[PDB]
Amino acid sequence: MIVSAIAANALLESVTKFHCGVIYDYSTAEYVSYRPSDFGAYLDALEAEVARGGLIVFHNGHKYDVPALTKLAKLQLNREFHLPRENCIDTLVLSRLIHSNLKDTDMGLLRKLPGKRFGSHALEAWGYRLGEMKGEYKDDFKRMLEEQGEEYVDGMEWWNFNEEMMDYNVQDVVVTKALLEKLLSDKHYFPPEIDFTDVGYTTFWSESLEAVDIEHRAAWLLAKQERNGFPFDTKAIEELYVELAARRSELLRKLTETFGSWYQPKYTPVEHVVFNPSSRDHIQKKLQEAGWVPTKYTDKGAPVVDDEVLEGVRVDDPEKQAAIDLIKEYLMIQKRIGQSAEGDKAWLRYVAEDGKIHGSVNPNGAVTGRATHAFPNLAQIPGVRSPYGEQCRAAFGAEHHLDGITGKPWVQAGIDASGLELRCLAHFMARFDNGEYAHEILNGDIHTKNQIAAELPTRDNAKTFIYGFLYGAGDEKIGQIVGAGKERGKELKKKFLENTPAIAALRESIQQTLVESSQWVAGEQQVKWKRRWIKGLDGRKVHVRSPHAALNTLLQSAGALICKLWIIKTEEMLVEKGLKHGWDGDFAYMAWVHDEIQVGCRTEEIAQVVIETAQEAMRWVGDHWNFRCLLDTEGKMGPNWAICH
Template sequence: MARYLFDCETDGLLDTLTQVHSLVLRDPDSGFTFSCTPHRYSTDDITIITDWTVEDALHALMHADEIIGHNIIKFDIPALQKVYPWFEPKGKITDTLVCSRLIWADIADHDLKQVRKGYPGKLVGSHSLKAWGYRLGVLKGEFGETSDWATWTPEMQTYCEQDVTVTAELYARIVKKEPTEKSLWIEHEFAKIIAMQERHGFAFNEDEAVKLYNQLVKRRLEISGELQEAFPPVEKTEVFIPKVNNRQRGYVKGEPFTKKWMVEFNPSSRQMIADRLQAMGWEPQEFTPSGQPKIDETILQALPYPEAKVLAEHFLVEKRIGQLAEGDQAWLKLVRKGRIHGSVNTNGAVTGRCTHSNPNVAQVPRVGSPYGAECRALFATTARWVLVGADLSGLELRCLAHFMALFDGGEYGRIVLEGDIHTVNQNAAGLPTRNDAKTFIYAFLYGAGDQKIGSIVAPDASPEEQKRIGKKLKRQFLAKTPALRRLREVVELKVLGFVPKAKPLLVNPSYEHLWRQDSAKQWWFKAGAGGVLIGLDGRKLHIRSAHAALNTLLQSAGALISKVSMILAYQELSTRGYVFGRDYAFVAHIHDEIQTECRPELADEVGQIVVQAMRDAGTFFAFGCPIDGEFKIGNNWKETH
């Protein structure tokens, strides 16, 4: 079985590179390294072979049973294919970056403990080779940070060899962790599709974006005028005793002098906003860690003062302008040739959910929010193509029903599918309206605290009163939903390190605290440190606190259903002969949503394929509650979600 670890160095990033400077392979079984470059190069290390050409190395990689490298799915393989279009690996692809994010999703927690021992603070939470070099004690070197990539040098070749050394050490660590085959397959297949999505990009209407920017800037100026009228300049005074005479300023040494000046209202200063509102009679209920009154859109919108509504709009307009044009990751700053190429970390959260950056496409405002429709409409399609948006239906509640089925035989799932689950939840929690019940259940599942829950039905109450109400609502809801209460207990007990066990007749009183009884009168024994749950695909979910356990379990299940949906959709589209980029392309994958652009005549078929893939994802995991989805066809994101 032929296996190679490898790394390459080029003269630029994926969109600009023109040549491969270095390509280094290592046979992990023999220990030999093949250091290849188009330039003359030699080394005294007898384990490094330098007489292979780059083409020799590419052929070896193409015909290997397995190739292993760090970030090879997103960079090295497409980089090599850009310069050598005939290069097509035939064996298994193992990306140590994908593995690292899967196995050590909580790596930041470990890194923070090592900072005092010399681990670089700027690398906390990083899965880069440089970060792993520090963790493994095999440093990468500094070549890439201090040198020009345009021209090959022997130091560059040595740097590439060292990258392979670090990768080999990391791979050995990964193998020892024994991640499940199912989790590895899901993350690698999904990463391949997302890499194609990133390179393809999401069509972006720059002309309309500029028009929207102008509209928002105009509104910002109007709001500024309204705020200056609402909050006129305030005179400030300060008495001080001059140390010297100053005839021009009227100072006389040793005699008190009163300085006066006017302070313009600054709507970007939250402290100034709080001062002005308190002068109007506002009594703040929430405070920042530093003790200042908390000021945000939600708080301002809820206040009875007309001036507060204008301030809330100021914050919102500034936020939209930042997203659109003026922020560091503004869409108009990042669009290239009419497309947004957002970056996706395919395992960025401990739950297995994706995280997004450059820009964060997941934060494009929804259609129902202010300027949301205008923002969504900017994300469109390739000329003469259409957009197909597919969503998983009621994913959170179906995931909850799947796990509750262990305790209620599938009853909650039947209500989700056939009845009105929100009315059932409304009655269980004793909530006044069905809409309150919808807000309540999602807040509850996402781990909301007592105060947040209480604010749903008592938004104007004090924080203490909201906490009291929230606690009561949770207690009522769990009392009338015993399967959920049992699920929550079991999950939290497992996270705390307990295992179910028959309690002995005699227990030493000093060890009594190691036993705990749940609502089903089952005994649990403290058997370990805990902190871990197992996801649908066998991955370890690292839980920071017991109260976050159920939320983490549900989010992970939803993330995996969504990932497998995209994998199965891609496989079916490929089976039918459709080619990514020629007939269709995925342009966005956000939580429970898949956006696909395609030729118009394929739109309905593509929508049906993606929705069927969502159903099949439930079957893939033997889900206790059937998964389903729905799709819309349109010309932009506003019309398809």
């Protein structure tokens, strides 16, 4: 087992040059350094450690470091260099599962950290937390150039090689080794009956938990689909921007003549301030002086203003009754513009040269094992029920990738699971009601018949209501779904509690398992805990934030892991079936939002093979962990991500 550290010139998007690299070994204890001219020797050392059957320890190695080596070894000296995924291990993917909660334990330490490093899994932040940090390269280089007198141009100091870079690379691999010893000094994930610094890739993976293996496979696959990208159409979103940027410049002209300006106190100094519809103070004032009473006081002196009170508002003047609808449309158009094209993290500021969007996906960002999406967020674009939704999802298509050998577009397949957490509930409470609840879910659709039984208008409203009732609501927040009062908010709770009297028994079981005493304060809550964590489906200590969200962190943390294994198995069957992953093959993953997957493939027969084998992968997931239910999915085929929603 060796511990390697790299340093190159730029990010993985545009990297062309190698600068330095340090290797430490666990059998000779040698800081074997390398130079810019020793890159062949560096690759030979890594290939020797692979060929003898060992493990290479990087940090952030799956996302950046290993494909940087595969790119540099090709485009600098013309040689193929691939590391097998069962040899490379990471110490960031291990940190995101072992220390999954830094924001709730990092206070009391901020005396150590500067303040910008609060709750960071970066390698320098663990240098500050382990009390082993000797300077920083960027600060010392900036201080050096200000001491010489030449300017500091762009914050790009990895242009030229020097000797301080090697020293801070040595300190970097020191911090990586001192992190690895603590991360392997854990006992719940690594049993203390064997030393993990001399075992092979058949002992290290399969003589420990399954959560240490599934997380590395997920990090590998999600880094690969991050490197693939998402095909994007630019002209069809510039047409949308030029369409609805000539609408908010009419909804203000038509509206400031209705709602006039006023003098507001800044001898009494006044200023001529005009009506700004994006503010929620000007609309509150102009509705206060036009004859409207809120009768809803969230704030202690101000009302609440949102889309559910701008519908139930009536005034005397019949012009303002039409003006309020234009105010709501103006707020919608403003949010649409700021998301699509004018924001700091807009869509048109993260399009590469080849017409694709690369978004970072953190596989373990939530406390319940749910992935987060950032820079930009491709799990937050407007759906097909919101206005201007289909015109925003039609640009995010897979038919915008014309093929590089025949000049033809591709086909997209999208696969969604059905009744995921609601069927995990029937898994978990099947030991109480003897499994006569997990038979009605398999007998026809669940949400449609729930809508029939509860006389909700839409299936989406029934689906919102059932999880709102299930994850511990109050008396009013499920009466608000239909708009009625707390009388209906009580009778719906009684109707869906007296049907299956096992949810309260399961909740009492969770309360008797986790909490033992909870003292009551008139403004707070003081609880003596017994077990703050919950064993998940693969032994991972899932952290619990509040004792009334215990059913939540028991259901969604067990629902995310079956999707996380399903996305791995549905390519482990496709590669073994005789296909090729990537753009130069037959299929490519594009995006993984919390439930469904979006894959793009070359022909319709390959689409049919993928949409067949997704079912077999999901059934193997359902058989591997011995669920008491029967898991099932549903797939669609199309050109873009508006039919394949």
